[PDB]
């Protein structure tokens, strides 16, 4: 769909998981999609834990410099539903564990721009009715 729709979806998603009740006034359609992605990223995380001993922490110390390489790397060979969910779950980890909850700082905007540009640059919206 619309590029503005996907930019709005990613920002709303990041704001919701950031506990940033610095709300919005977006529509019903964006909100039900944010909900589906939140549910999917939790189911994803649960699979990640069932398979691995550690979680994302160590690899994200320098997320401000490497995030784009991680995403590029994530979609180097193929793009599918599961990896796109991993894409959002990484972002959810940054807002939940790395950054401060409840406030929308400049680093959130950096995370947002990064994810919005990557999601769009790579036509990620074509692999998602999920």
């Amino acid at each position: 769909k619309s590029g503005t729709y996907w930019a709005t979806l990613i920002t709303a998603f990041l704001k919701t998981v950031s506990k940033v009740e610095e709300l919005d006034c977006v529509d019903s359609a964006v909100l039900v999609d944010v909900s589906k992605i939140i549910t999917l990223t939790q189911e994803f995380r649960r699979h990640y834990d069932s398979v691995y001993r550690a979680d994302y922490g160590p690899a994200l110390k320098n997320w401000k410099r490497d995030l784009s390489k991680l995403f590029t790397s994530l979609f180097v060979d193929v793009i599918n539903s599961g990896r796109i969910v991993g894409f959002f779950d990484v972002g959810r980890y940054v807002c939940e564990e790395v950054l401060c909850p409840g406030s929308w700082t400049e680093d959130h905007e950096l995370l947002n721009d990064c994810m919005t540009h990557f999601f769009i640059e790579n036509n990620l919206m074509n692999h998602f009715p999920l």
């Binding site: 691995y52 160590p58 390489k69 994530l74 599918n80 539903s81």
Partner: peptide, 24 residues
């Protein structure tokens, strides 16, 4: 930089397997 690669690897694996316990 390598540790980052381990992450993308763990994510690709989980992404691919997610696809089937959700792909069914």
């Amino acid at each position: 930089g390598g540790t980052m690669e381990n992450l993308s690897r763990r994510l690709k694996v989980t992404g691919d397997l997610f696809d089937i316990m959700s792909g069914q």
